[PDB]
């Protein structure tokens, strides 16, 4: 079936690599990760957050409305 011998036809692509023992496992981990993490967060925040913000607003409103509904209504005891 699908085996490394025959998956696709590729030509004129050169890949240079390094031994794991010749390179650092965490090269520029913070100084490059933090800007990259910020970039990814900026890209994805406008797509992910708004639905959860709406959910939180709905949750707070529903909890407040339920708590108000459980509260006593003075107008029922005017007489």
């Amino acid at each position: 079936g699908r085996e490394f011998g025959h998956l696709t036809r590729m030509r004129h692509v050169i890949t240079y690599s390094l031994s794991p023992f010749e390179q650092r496992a965490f090269p520029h981990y913070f100084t490059k990760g933090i800007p990259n993490v910020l970039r990814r967060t900026r890209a994805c925040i406008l797509r992910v957050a708004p639905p959860f913000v709406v959910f939180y607003l709905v949750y707070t409103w529903g909890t407040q409305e339920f708590e108000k509904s459980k509260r006593k209504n003075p107008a029922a005891y005017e007489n």
């Binding site: 036809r9 590729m10 004129h12 692509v13």
Partner: protein
């Protein structure tokens, strides 16, 4: 139409495949028609597509992006696969219409 052109450009920028150096036809889902169209592509176009896809996969592996000036420009994006796919789909439609009779 100018507003349509503007919103199309905005969506092209929003769809971040250009940020990976890809072209529009690289992102197409490889169904039977797309597979046939790829198999009909001339060798240079096929090799360019394969390298672009491999580079995009390498970029996504490291969660990185291509430099700002290397992103595929919307106005210079070439729909290389579109004619071949159109022909393949036309042929499939003809075969299905014959089968209908």
């Amino acid at each position: 139409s100018k507003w349509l052109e503007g919103i199309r450009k905005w969506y092209y920028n929003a769809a971040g495949f250009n940020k990976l150096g890809l072209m529009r036809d690289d992102t197409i889902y490889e169904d039977d028609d797309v597979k046939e169209a790829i198999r009909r592509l001339p060798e240079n176009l096929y090799n360019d597509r394969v390298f672009r896809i491999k580079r995009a996969l390498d970029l996504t592996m490291r969660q990185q992006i291509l430099p700002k000036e290397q992103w595929t420009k919307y106005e210079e994006d070439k729909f290389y696969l579109e004619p071949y796919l159109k022909e393949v789909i036309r042929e499939r439609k003809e075969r299905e219409e014959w089968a209908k009779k």
